Ligand SMILES: Cc1cc2nc3c(=O)[nH]c(=O)nc-3n(C[C@H](O)[C@H](O)[C@H](O)COP(=O)(O)O)c2cc1C
Ligand SMILES: Cc1cc(=O)oc2c1ccc1oc([C@@H](O)c3ccccc3)c(-c3ccccc3)c12
């Protein structure tokens with residue numbers, strides 16, 4: 170542990186939580202990040218942490234999950250924080266406000282958050298122009314092993330969900346290294362067929378990978394159906410998982426019964442187990458980005474061994490601050506060595522073998 174890590178986790182973040190309501194804290198974090206007002210990320214990525222997947226090189230396997238930079242305002246700051254890849258969004262076709270405030274809640278006793286933002290979004294056009302302003306800068310970053318993902322949502326009032334996602338593919342697909350869609354079976358197949366057709370219609374230099382992001386709350390039937398459709402259609406990857414609408418026994422936070430998705434430590438092993446299941450259902454042939462409750466190297470390695478090629482974190486920033494990124498990377502590198510892995514790649518799915 171560095172001095173910065175301990176200072177942030179033990180002193181600064183608890184103090185700042187006392188001063189800032191959750192959505193204010195989130196907004197101020199985005200602003201600070203976008204301006205580069207960050208502690209030094211002195212951790213230097215080693216070759217051990219490099220991963221090749223989804224048609225790209227990732228300098229390190231620790232990404233920022235969707236929902237932090239919903240509108241593409243802080244991408245460069247997020248790379249400066251040490252993330253190996255950045256996912257923005259969710260972005261909806263038309264701008265929309267989301268749910269009324271308050272809509273974000275901290276459960277500090279649980280190292281958890283509950284949110285019901287409701288896909289607040291500046292909309293595709295605004296984000297398109299924001300990404301266009303730095304498109305060549307991003308091309309260089311991606312070439313250097315720092316890819317960009319875009320998570321596509323749908324508007325609240327949309328009649329045709331597939332058409333909302335198709336619009337996102339057309340508008341932000343050409344600016345992304347990968348796209349994400351959050352998810353009967355025939356209907357899923359029809360939607361993903363439309364998304365992939367739109368993707369395939371982009372010019373080759375502008376053609377992203379397409380991933381499906383799933384919730385931790387799906388039935389066994391749902392998961393078997395998704396695995397089947399993903400393999401049938403050649404979906405490029407899975408993101409496992411979004412937040413949970415479950416409320417695990419043992420939550421202590423006063424706000425535990427707020428409506429919304431639960432993230433952070435109580436989601437962690439639900440997410441890891443869903444990774445394990447999806448890796449098995451897809452025979453290890455479909456790359457998985459593992460996400461949910463990662464706040465340490467052990468957490469990251471458990472997801473990688475369960476089947477994830479990459480991981481993301483988000484909620485841990487609330488409690489550990491920006492130094493958590495270097496913390497997870499340093500700890501992951503140490504554990505890989507301790508467990509006889511040459512690098513991240515050797516550890517992917519190692520539990521299944
Ligand atoms: C405040 C907040 C907002 C989020 N918004 C989105 C979103 O817009 N799209 C999405 O796919 N996931 C969203 N997520 C889910 C995260 O991407 C991630 O899947 C989940 O929080 C689990 O990771 P974590 O425990 O490390 O936070 C959001 C999560 C939080 C906490
Ligand atoms: C969703 C959300 C809720 C929340 O209550 O706080 C959040 C939330 C989402 C992301 C967050 O990141 C930070 C922080 O680590 C940070 C990162 C980058 C720059 C500057 C600061 C806080 C943070 C900031 C201040 C006080 C408490 C927490 C935070």
Ligand SMILES: O=C(O)c1cc(=O)[nH]c(=O)[nH]1
Pocket residue numbers: 236259284285286287288289351411412430
């Ligand atoms: O905007 C939101 O409410 C949101 C979207 C999402 O995909 N996941 C989440 O937890 N919140």
